[PDB]
Amino acid sequence: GMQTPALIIVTGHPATGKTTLSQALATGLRLPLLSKDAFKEVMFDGLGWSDREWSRRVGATAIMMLYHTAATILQSGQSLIMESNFRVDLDTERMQNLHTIAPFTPIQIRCVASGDVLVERILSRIAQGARHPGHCDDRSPADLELVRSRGDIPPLPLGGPLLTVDTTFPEQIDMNAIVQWVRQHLQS
Template identity: 40%
Template sequence: MRSPLLLIISGPPGSGKTTLGRRLASELWLPFVYKDGIKERLFDTLGWRDRAWSQQLGIATYELLYYFLEVQLAAGCSQIIESNFAAEFATQRFLLLKEQYSFRPCQLMCRTQGEVLLARFKLRAEDGSRHPGHVDQLTYGELEAGLLKGRLEPLAIPGEVIEVDTTDFDSIDYGGLMQQIRALL
């Protein structure tokens, strides 16, 4: 029996990770756990205030994300997880999970042209489509340099790495991407 596939979707804020994850989960019938989904539940339950509170809930959010990941891995389930995983912090966590559980990781790295990403991030922060608890409008200065890079580095773990250019959502080859992923399932 093949070990479960773990699709890890990562990329900078606003790069389309959640949109991609929802679509893949729907088409592949896989569980999808994503950082902002957990964090927004915490905002709705515990309230939201300022940047410091958002960061504190962010720490709890990651612990819950990893907990849900472990529950599914222990059950031998393929799944999709999504966050803006920073390689310098998350790599070690995934390597430890790999020692405990048998799974095949595949990273889907969302990347976007920097100027497009910055504009998308600002629009999303201001148009009311995002939960106000994220207080994104207070993070422009903090995140601008990273957003202009348009990408994050993949985790230093074994497995496939697939780059997905999300600069223009309409130009993504979903058929080709699905074919690559189905071959791994």
């Protein structure tokens, strides 16, 4: 059909639950999922990894791949989910540029959690190796105090609906309710 496709943006600071949530949305809505960190990991596996500067350069490149791949999916009329710790200062204009070549209707989910919970997750994920080593995640005492005192990520000013999901206490999260929230908005 001629309908404008939906672009579901899942954002949040690192460790706020955006990975799990975006994956649940992909399974629940049967939609393609483009994740910055997943793209970075494909690149670390193909080109190698080293230090934080390389991680940053690979991340900037992964973000470029995310927008490139999104455009061709949206141009086919298919909806999709994009997940990253999006930055208002740079991603607002990237989303505008995307919209110009591949029109979409935005739906945004922002994940948040307490500093203490975020610090616990960052540490355990790195200790238990759930996190790819190439990311070279800043895990020093200063880094963790910055994580702890950061507050919630600002959402992208895209228009359209926004849901904020606090994952501080995961037991309180009803994933199907979140999927249904998106479905209702896709239906409109």
